[PDB]
Amino acid sequence: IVGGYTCGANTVPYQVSLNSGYHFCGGSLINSQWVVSAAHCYKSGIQVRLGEDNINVVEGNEQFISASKSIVHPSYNSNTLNNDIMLIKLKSAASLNSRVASISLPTSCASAGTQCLISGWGNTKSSGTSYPDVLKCLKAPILSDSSCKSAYPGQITSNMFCAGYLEGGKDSCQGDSGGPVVCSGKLQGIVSWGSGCAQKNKPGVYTKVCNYVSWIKQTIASN
Ligand SMILES: NC(=[NH2+])c1cc2cccnc2s1
Ligand SMILES: [Ca+2]
């Protein structure tokens, strides 16, 4: 996250860190047994780490649970990143408490102008590399689809939306992949892609979760 702030330990209780020996993607807890992340974050051998703040220090509120199965969307296209969403089932149910909570799925899509909260442990420099150990947060609005499509001609589908600032300065970045974009108490997006980080007229692109609620609900009830 570039131009954001330190969230505060466990102030984003649904935030997840996917670990395969190191942190490589974020995710969101939707109920005690399931996590939603980005399909481009798919790997075999994932351990989900809940209740984390500093990912390099065991502070006492973490739960490390291995994944029993991963399901990448049936229509994920790695070349265009269309349908960039995946579900991960935990081997054991997590214990929900104040520091580990799940986030709600949306009932309808959010409107341009709505302010959201984006979080993650990704790079904090637009021109450089500095990975933080504690969770960073960024409040950003959803942009109009026309400004999103003008920045990325022929690349945005109806399953994506842009959020951020066209002036540049504040944005999600590498390492933030798979993490949450929460607006009005619902999970509306997943950090998916962009061009550089915090560049002018190059906002971040997010998977539009409101288009996948039926697929999510149906898949978790049959697995
Ligand atoms: N600028 C963004 N919002 C980006 C997010 C990601 C996520 C993965 C890879 N590259 C990028 S750029
Ligand atoms: Ca920790």
Curated annotation (Swiss-Prot):
How is the co-factor bound, per the entry?
Binds 1 Ca(2+) ion per subunit.
Q: How is its activity regulated?
A: Is inhibited by scorpion cyclotide trypsin inhibitor TopI1.
Is the keyword S-adenosyl-L-methionine in the record?
no
| UniProtKB keywords | Calcium, Digestion, Disulfide bond, Hydrolase, Metal-binding, Protease, Secreted, Serine protease, Signal, Zymogen
The record's section on Gene3D superfamilies has: Trypsin-like serine proteases
- GO cellular component terms attached to this protein's record: extracellular space; serine protease inhibitor complex
- List the catalysed reactions: Preferential cleavage: Arg-|-Xaa, Lys-|-Xaa
Biological process terms from the Gene Ontology for this record are: digestion; proteolysis
How is the polypeptide modified once translated? Answer: Subsequent cleavage after Lys-125 leads to alpha-trypsin. Further cleavage after Lys-170 yields pseudotrypsin. A cleavage may also occur after Arg-99. Not sulfated on tyrosine residue(s).
The transmembrane residues are none
**Primary localization:** secreted
Q: Which residues are responsible for catalysis?
A: H40 (charge relay system), D84 (charge relay system), S177 (charge relay system)
The family database entries (SMART domains) matched by this protein are listed as: Tryp_SPc
Write down the Pfam families for this protein, in alphabetical order: Trypsin
Q: Which domain of life is it from?
A: Eukaryota
Per UniProt, residues of the Peptidase S1 domain are 1-221
Q: How does it assemble?
A: Interacts with SERPINA1.
**What protein family does this chain belong to?**
Belongs to the peptidase S1 family.
Q: What is this protein called?
A: Serine protease 1
- Organism expressing this protein natively: Bos taurus (Bovine)
